[PDB]
A and B are shown apart, each in its own frame.
Chain A
Amino acid sequence: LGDFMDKRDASIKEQLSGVKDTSSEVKQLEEQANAVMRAARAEISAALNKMKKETQ
């Protein structure tokens, strides 16, 4: 008579744990979506300047 309500509350428990790890993953994936173009744009200007020194 106990495990029947244990399951019905454990559903909300696993749900809230899932939403917590979900929000962590959302911020991390948006960080990486910013980061890939940011890394490309920054390093391309880096190589631009460095090769431009030898060009001058």
Chain B
Amino acid sequence: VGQHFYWQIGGFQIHGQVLITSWVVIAILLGSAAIAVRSPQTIPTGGQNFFEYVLEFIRDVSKTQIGEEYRPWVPFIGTMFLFIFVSNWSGALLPWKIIQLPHGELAAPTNDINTTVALALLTSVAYFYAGLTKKGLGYFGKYIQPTPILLPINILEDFTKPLSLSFRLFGNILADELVVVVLVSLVPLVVPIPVMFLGLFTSGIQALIFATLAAAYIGESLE
């Protein structure tokens, strides 16, 4: 219910949920990835099997969509998959109503503006750079050979697509926060029992659809 910020000034007014949630989720993700890659065997053992299953999932969803050179963007789209996956599970699970904050709240990284618009902005910078790379440096995909009208709408869609994906992530995670907060504010938690399954299913497939939607748009960057 308190989603704005708290006054931890650092040169500009910065959001507190953004900072702490994204920092701790990146920290636990790298703590999971780093300690289990120290001593891996050639056989897919206990955690290495799970990590390699995730990575071959990313290999398939990156091989089917983009083009001939998806492998350097597999790190980007894979860290994006892992981020959305663990942040959705942490929003569904990790307790943040018993801990109280004097100025605001602390639920998830995508609840606020910054860590969804940052994903949109990084993807858009990647699309413009990859378009100036794979295509020439005079005119990127904007240039209109067949139709004499599509010239402004080309840059207009190249502007309105990242914000659209941002709004997708918004309308998912903010809706999920509303579900969980009003559903635990109803009464003692005998009611969330069937709804938790639907939330888990939607969160997992939310991670998957964000992954394939990043893949599709670096595919358009390739095109």
Contacts and interface: CB of A to CB of B under 8 A. Distances in A.
Interface stretch (B44-52, B94-102, B124-132, B201-209): B44-52
A1 B51 contact: yes
Interface in A1-35: 1-2, 4-5, 7-8
A7 B51 contact: no
A4 B43 CA distance: 8
| Secondary structure of the A contact surface, majority rule | helix
Nearest to A7: B42
Interface residues of B, number: 9
Interface residues of A, number: 6
Nearest to A4: B42
A39 B21 CA distance: 84
A4 B40 contact: yes
B55 interface: yes
Interface of B: 37, 40, 42, 44, 48, 51-52, 55-56
Given A2-B55, A4-B40, 13 more contacts: A1-B37, A1-B40, A1-B48, A1-B51, A1-B52, A4-B42, A4-B44, A4-B48, A4-B52, A5-B52, A5-B56, A7-B42, A8-B42
